[PDB]
Amino acid sequence: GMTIVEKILAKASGKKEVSPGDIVMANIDVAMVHDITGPLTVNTLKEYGIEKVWNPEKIVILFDHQVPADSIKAAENHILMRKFVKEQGIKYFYDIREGVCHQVLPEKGHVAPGEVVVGADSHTCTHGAFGAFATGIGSTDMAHVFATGKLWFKVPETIYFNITGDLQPYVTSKDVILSIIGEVGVDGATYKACQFGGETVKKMSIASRMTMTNMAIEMGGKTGIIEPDEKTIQYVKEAMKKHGTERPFEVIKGDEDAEFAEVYEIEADKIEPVFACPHNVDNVKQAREVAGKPIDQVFIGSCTNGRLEDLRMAIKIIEKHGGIADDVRVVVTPASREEYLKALKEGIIEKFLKYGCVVTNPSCSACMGSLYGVLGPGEVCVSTSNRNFRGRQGSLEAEIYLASPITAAACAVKGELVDPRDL
Numbered sequence: 001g002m003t004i005v006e007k008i009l010a011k012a013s014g015k016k017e018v019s020p021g022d023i024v025m026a027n028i029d030v031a032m033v034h035d036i037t038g039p040l041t042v043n044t045l046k047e048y049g050i051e052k053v054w055n056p057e058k059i060v061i062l063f064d065h066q067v068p069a070d071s072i073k074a075a076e077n078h079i080l081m082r083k084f085v086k087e088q089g090i091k092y093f094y095d096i097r098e099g100v101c102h103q104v105l106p107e108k109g110h111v112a113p114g115e116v117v118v119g120a121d122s123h124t125c126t127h128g129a130f131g132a133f134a135t136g137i138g139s140t141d142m143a144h145v146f147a148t149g150k151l152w153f154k155v156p157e158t159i160y161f162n163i164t165g166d167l168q169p170y171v172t173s174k175d176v177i178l179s180i181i182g183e184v185g186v187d188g189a190t191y192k193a194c195q196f197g198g199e200t201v202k203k204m205s206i207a208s209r210m211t212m213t214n215m216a217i218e219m220g221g222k223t224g225i226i227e228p229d230e231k232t233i234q235y236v237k238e239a240m241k242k243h244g245t246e247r248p249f250e251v252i253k254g255d256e257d258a259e260f261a262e263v264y265e266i267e268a269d270k271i272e273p274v275f276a277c278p279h280n281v282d283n284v285k286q287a288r289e290v291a292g293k294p295i296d297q298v299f300i301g302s303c304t305n306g307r308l309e310d311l312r313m314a315i316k317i318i319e320k321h322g323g324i325a326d327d328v329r330v331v332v333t334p335a336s337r338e339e340y341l342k343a344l345k346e347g348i349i350e351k352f353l354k355y356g357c358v359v360t361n362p363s364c365s366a367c368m369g370s371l372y373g374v375l376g377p378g379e380v381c382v383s384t385s386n387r388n389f390r391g392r393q394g395s396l397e398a399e400i401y402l403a404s405p406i407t408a409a410a411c412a413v414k415g416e417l418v419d420p421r422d423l
């Protein structure tokens with residue numbers, strides 16, 4: 001009787017069974033690296049004299065196509081990456097501006113149910129939306145992965161969030177996950193896989209599911225995971241066909257009599273629009289109880305969201321209420337080029353433009369970085385981001401409220417923190 005994570009790690013280590021706390025050596029299906037972890041990893045490999053990665057088709061590299069105009073080190077790192085990709089015969093390499101980190105990997109078909117996914121970023125948990133075991137690892141582990149196609153993992157315990165009921169109007173999976181995190185706390189799920197399931201999750205789209213697993217790490221989770229269903233299978237198969245990345249996969253599900261460290265019953269019909277308020281993702285408040293505070297900027301589409309359903313719900317709110325308030329900069333960033341195209345074809349982009357919204361291209365590098373330069377001092381911002389920028393948020397006592405795309409759009413409309421149901 002095993003959880004989905006246990007089964008995935010059992011299969012991957014060739015074991016009959018696995019229990020939390022077991023330390024097992026698991027085959028890696030896909031390893032993703034972007035920005036600096038790329039050059040660290042390649043360098044470590046050079047130092048050990050490793051001529052070849054284990055499988056050039058199970059490595060996904062995101063890297064800036066533009067040579068950085070000043071620093072010679074980054075031009076050097078850039079030449080290094082191109083050499084590696086070429087010599088190793090790495091098939092799957094993408095511009096850092098193909099999309100935000102965690103959008104590009106699944107949309108090209110690189111994440112299937114039952115797979116072990118490792119990534120250089122803290123928010124690789126995102127890919128657990130696909131019934132995959134997905135974790136962020138450092139460059140030392142990443143070099144080991146590139147060399148051998150294996151890594152030691154400690155099997156985590158699972159907390160199961162059973163989410164049932166129907167989401168009320170104007171409420172999204174962003175509000176569900178934020179509400180879960182306000183209760184559990186930034187450290188409440190340390191070492192644990194956070195599994196979301198239940199009738200409410202079944203009805204959610206893949207896009208909505210990804211927003212939840214995206215933020216598992218924000219409560220100290222080891223990862224986030226949702227079992228695959230028909231929507232999952234069809235998304236993955238369609239993505240594989242579009243990009244030529246077909247490979248066999250096994251849909252793995254947890255057992256009905258699996259053990260969990262904890263089980264939360266989440267009443268979805270009770271979730272309301274919420275904000276994560278400065279300065280902790282933990283500090284979650286019902287929108288009404290903060291409503292009224294004037295705001296300077298709104299970011300709709302961020303790390304990792306701004307998929308088509310996010311852009312729809314945002315543009316519907318804005319266009320219905322006649323555009324955006326005065327003295328609010330509203331930046332709209334589709335999660336990927338592929339998502340940008342879908343929005344373009346549906347006339348959504350043209351409409352954001354019409355209301356004086358800035359529409360900008362996504363960049364994986366933006367998710368990793370400093371917010372120095374984007375927010376002015378003392379400015380209040382509403383963001384659909386699913387990750388914190390603590391430490392380097394940044395410029396410097398700027399205030400940043402995390403919200404769903406619906407609430408973010410509402411805020412853009414009124415020019416203040418507002419509950420979208422109150423427009």
Ligand SMILES: CC(C)(O)CC(C)(C)O
Pocket residue numbers: 299301302303366367371374381382383384385389400
């Ligand atoms: C990446 C970003 C520009 O969306 C972050 C934020 C916090 C300003 O939304």
Ligand SMILES: [Mg+2]
Pocket residue numbers: 102123214303304367386387
């Ligand atoms: Mg992210």
